[PDB]
Amino acid sequence: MGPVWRKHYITYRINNYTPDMNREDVDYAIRKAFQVWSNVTPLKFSKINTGMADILVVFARGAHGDDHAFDGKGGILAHAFGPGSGIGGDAHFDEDEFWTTHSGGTNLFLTAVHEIGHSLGLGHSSDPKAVMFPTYKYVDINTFRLSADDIRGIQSLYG
Ligand SMILES: COc1ccc(S(=O)(=O)N(CC(=O)NO)CC(C)C)cc1
Numbered sequence: 001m002g003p004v005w006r007k008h009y010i011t012y013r014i015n016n017y018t019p020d021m022n023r024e025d026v027d028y029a030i031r032k033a034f035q036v037w038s039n040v041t042p043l044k045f046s047k048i049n050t051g052m053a054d055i056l057v058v059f060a061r062g063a064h065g066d067d068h069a070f071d072g073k074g075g076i077l078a079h080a081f082g083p084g085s086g087i088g089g090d091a092h093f094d095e096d097e098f099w100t101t102h103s104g105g106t107n108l109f110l111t112a113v114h115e116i117g118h119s120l121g122l123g124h125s126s127d128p129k130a131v132m133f134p135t136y137k138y139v140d141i142n143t144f145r146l147s148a149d150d151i152r153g154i155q156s157l158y159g
């Protein structure tokens with residue numbers, strides 16, 4: 001298995017906020033995305049507002065300091081680093097996308113669930129029902145669930 005957090009208590013911080021959405025709606029999407037994974041593992045997530053966090057959530061465009069520049073509107077939507085110090089764990093969202101609460105543009109919650117999966121150590125899935133399948137597809141958020149493959153994947157890393 002690839003890198004995992006060697007602890008079950010994991011912190012996150014939102015570095016900055018997309019102007020595409022209201023701040024409250026970003027906070028909500030991210031909280032809900034962590035909750036998806038917390039609900040199927042022994043992992044506990046704590047949001048910090050200031051200071052050192054394990055998982056930094058970042059909205060940025062183009063070349064943004066890591067060796068993985070974004071590519072403008074479309075194409076790559078987001079990427080994340082597996083567990084580790086510093087940039088390890090961090091989840092970055094391409095600001096050249098239009099982030100949304102809904103089925104228009106790119107749904108932040110669904111994208112964040114996938115990215116946090118990477119921040120926890122998951123790779124891509126070959127199951128098209130898995131959130132870790134590497135194509136963005138809107139699905140009804142109120143009825144969203146991890147697939148059996150996503151749960152196998154994350155439980156193989158933690159618990
Ligand atoms: C549901 O969340 C997704 C997040 C990013 C992408 S993506 O298209 O940017 N992409 C990059 C990636 O996997 N980042 O995590 C896949 C791809 C082009 C292989 C697709 C789906």
Ligand SMILES: [Ca+2]
Nearest residue numbers: 054086088089
């Ligand atoms: Ca980090």
Ligand SMILES: [Ca+2]
Nearest residue numbers: 072074076094
């Ligand atoms: Ca892009």
Ligand SMILES: [Ca+2]
Nearest residue numbers: 020095097098
């Ligand atoms: Ca944007």
Ligand SMILES: [Zn+2]
Nearest residue numbers: 064066068092
């Ligand atoms: Zn990046």
Ligand SMILES: [Zn+2]
Nearest residue numbers: 114118124134
């Ligand atoms: Zn991915």
